[PDB]
Design a protein around this motif. Structure first.
Motif, PDB file in Angstrom:
ATOM      1  N   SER A   3       1.005  -1.257   0.181  1.00  0.00           N
ATOM      2  CA  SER A   3      -0.098  -0.096   0.189  1.00  0.00           C
ATOM      3  C   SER A   3       0.520   1.046  -0.111  1.00  0.00           C
ATOM      4  CB  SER A   3      -1.158   0.044   0.806  1.00  0.00           C
ATOM      5  OG  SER A   3      -2.185  -0.922   0.998  1.00  0.00           O
ATOM      6  N   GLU A   4       0.236   2.708  -0.015  1.00  0.00           N
ATOM      7  CA  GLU A   4       0.570   4.041   0.379  1.00  0.00           C
ATOM      8  C   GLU A   4       1.946   4.009   1.321  1.00  0.00           C
ATOM      9  OE1 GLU A   4      -3.181   5.029   1.640  1.00  0.00           O
ATOM     10  OE2 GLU A   4      -3.041   5.897  -0.231  1.00  0.00           O
ATOM     11  N   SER A   5       2.310   5.255   0.608  1.00  0.00           N
ATOM     12  CA  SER A   5       4.045   5.596   0.700  1.00  0.00           C
ATOM     13  C   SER A   5       4.613   5.245   2.324  1.00  0.00           C
ATOM     14  CB  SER A   5       4.065   6.606   0.332  1.00  0.00           C
ATOM     15  OG  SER A   5       3.351   7.892   0.403  1.00  0.00           O
ATOM     16  N   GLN A   8       2.659   9.976   4.623  1.00  0.00           N
ATOM     17  CA  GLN A   8       2.439  10.033   3.796  1.00  0.00           C
ATOM     18  C   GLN A   8       1.064   9.195   3.513  1.00  0.00           C
ATOM     19  OE1 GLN A   8      -1.016  11.360   1.621  1.00  0.00           O
ATOM     20  NE2 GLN A   8      -0.140  12.832   2.357  1.00  0.00           N
ATOM     21  N   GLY A   9       1.301   7.987   3.161  1.00  0.00           N
ATOM     22  CA  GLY A   9       0.873   6.397   2.847  1.00  0.00           C
ATOM     23  C   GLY A   9       0.314   6.375   4.230  1.00  0.00           C
ATOM     24  N   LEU A  13      -2.964  12.808   5.027  1.00  0.00           N
ATOM     25  CA  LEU A  13      -3.179  13.292   3.363  1.00  0.00           C
ATOM     26  C   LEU A  13      -3.530  14.751   3.973  1.00  0.00           C
ATOM     27  CD1 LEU A  13      -6.443  10.425   2.574  1.00  0.00           C
ATOM     28  CD2 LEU A  13      -3.974  10.369   2.367  1.00  0.00           C
ATOM     29  N   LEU A  18       0.163  14.712   0.312  1.00  0.00           N
ATOM     30  CA  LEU A  18      -0.716  13.390  -0.878  1.00  0.00           C
ATOM     31  C   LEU A  18       0.509  13.524  -1.919  1.00  0.00           C
ATOM     32  CD1 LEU A  18      -3.441  12.105  -0.928  1.00  0.00           C
ATOM     33  CD2 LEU A  18      -3.343  13.304  -3.486  1.00  0.00           C
ATOM     34  N   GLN A  20       3.203  13.402  -2.288  1.00  0.00           N
ATOM     35  CA  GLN A  20       4.209  11.974  -1.260  1.00  0.00           C
ATOM     36  C   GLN A  20       3.980  10.659  -2.075  1.00  0.00           C
ATOM     37  OE1 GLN A  20       6.609  12.967   2.310  1.00  0.00           O
ATOM     38  NE2 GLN A  20       5.125  14.423   1.575  1.00  0.00           N
ATOM     39  N   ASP A  21       2.580  10.459  -2.228  1.00  0.00           N
ATOM     40  CA  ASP A  21       2.006   9.251  -2.388  1.00  0.00           C
ATOM     41  C   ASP A  21       1.974   9.586  -4.387  1.00  0.00           C
ATOM     42  OD1 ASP A  21       1.341   6.812  -1.212  1.00  0.00           O
ATOM     43  OD2 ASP A  21      -0.122   7.258  -2.369  1.00  0.00           O
ATOM     44  N   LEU A  22       1.442  10.543  -4.596  1.00  0.00           N
ATOM     45  CA  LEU A  22       0.967  10.917  -5.790  1.00  0.00           C
ATOM     46  C   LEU A  22       2.145  11.686  -7.061  1.00  0.00           C
ATOM     47  CD1 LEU A  22      -1.256  12.621  -5.301  1.00  0.00           C
ATOM     48  CD2 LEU A  22      -2.892  11.527  -5.280  1.00  0.00           C
ATOM     49  N   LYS A  23       3.536  12.062  -6.073  1.00  0.00           N
ATOM     50  CA  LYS A  23       4.313  12.466  -6.536  1.00  0.00           C
ATOM     51  C   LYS A  23       4.586  12.511  -8.121  1.00  0.00           C
ATOM     52  CE  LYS A  23       7.658  14.264  -2.910  1.00  0.00           C
ATOM     53  NZ  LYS A  23       8.614  14.605  -2.460  1.00  0.00           N
ATOM     54  N   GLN A  45      -8.049  16.762   0.862  1.00  0.00           N
ATOM     55  CA  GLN A  45      -6.636  16.519   0.449  1.00  0.00           C
ATOM     56  C   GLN A  45      -5.470  17.222   0.407  1.00  0.00           C
ATOM     57  OE1 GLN A  45      -6.693  14.938  -3.845  1.00  0.00           O
ATOM     58  NE2 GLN A  45      -5.019  16.210  -3.710  1.00  0.00           N
TER      59      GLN A  45
END
Length: 73
Positions: A3-5, A8-9, A13, A18, A20-23, A45
């Protein structure tokens, strides 16, 4: 792991966090910042664990299943 980072993850969020997750996905922050407000899951967000702690009550009114970690099949 699946899962997420991490920072952040695994905590909070934020638009800027966020990422950091979806950079790396959108063009200008303005575009992404607006778009998410309407199309994002929470349209928020930008909320930390500390803020989330005070504000919404998800688990107050939700029941999770007895899962292990990640299991999307």
């Amino acid at each position: 792991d699946i899962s997420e980072s991490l920072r952040q993850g695994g905590g909070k969020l934020n638009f800027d966090e966020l990422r950091q997750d979806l950079k790396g996905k959108g063009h200008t922050d303005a575009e992404i910042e607006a778009i998410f407000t309407k199309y994002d899951q929470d349209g928020d967000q930008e909320l930390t664990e500390h803020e989330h702690q005070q504000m919404r009550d998800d688990l107050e009114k939700e029941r999770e299943d007895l899962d292990l970690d990640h299991s999307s099949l």
